[PDB]
Design a protein around this ligand. Structure first.
Ligand SMILES: O=C(NC1CC1)c1cnn2cccnc12
Length: 185
């Protein structure tokens, strides 16, 4: 690709975070805590899953950012509608306002309904996420493998402002404590 020049500075929005997440002072890293993080509940917080949104809202243009996933067993990344459901159980699908990929149990999948098998030869340590609002496109790139394409959602129906979306995953195994980190430009 050649999308790096639409690079945007993403930061995490503490107020949207699940109450077990720990966001770094610079708002560029997030990890699962071993307990509730002593914050009040609010209507923005994802209740059921270890999710958090970026602070930035996008309604036009082309946007690109990169996320470090080093040594994680499980995660979800992409974008979502600002109006996605926060409370209770839900599936990650474009019908529910999410454009995502994930790692789960040694397989990578795109958040279609039903989910789509990805073919990645080089397990990624960093993921690039590209959004073209006007074109209706969300694309994912393997930064570890010279920027190779992972997946493209096209004909997307955003139907409102978009926010960067993150899921650090549960850590039942003790092997998924590592953070998600927004990578420098
Ligand atoms: O964005 C959408 N689809 C594209 C990404 C694959 C999309 C969002 N809601 N919805 C409802 C019916 C059909 N397609 C949709």
């Amino acid at each position: 690709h050649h999308h790096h020049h639409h690079m945007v500075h993403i930061t995490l929005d503490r107020n949207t975070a699940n109450s077990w997440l720990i966001i770094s002072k610079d708002r560029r890293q997030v990890r699962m805590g071993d307990t509730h993080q002593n914050v009040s509940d609010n209507k923005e917080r994802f209740s059921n899953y270890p999710m958090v949104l970026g602070a930035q809202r996008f309604s036009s243009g082309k946007m690109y950012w990169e996320v470090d996933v080093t040594q994680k067993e499980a995660w979800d990344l992409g974008v979502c509608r600002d109006s996605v459901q926060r409370k209770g159980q839900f599936s990650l699908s474009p019908e529910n306002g999410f454009w995502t990929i994930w790692l789960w149990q040694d397989s990578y999948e795109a958040g279609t309904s039903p989910q789509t098998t990805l073919h990645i030869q080089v397990p990624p340590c960093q993921i690039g996420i590209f959004v073209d609002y006007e074109a209706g496109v969300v694309s994912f790139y393997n930064i570890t493998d010279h920027g190779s394409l992972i997946y493209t959602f096209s004909e997307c129906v955003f139907a409102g402002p978009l926010r960067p979306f993150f899921n650090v995953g549960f850590n039942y195994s003790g092997g998924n404590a590592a953070p998600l980190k927004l990578c420098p430009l």
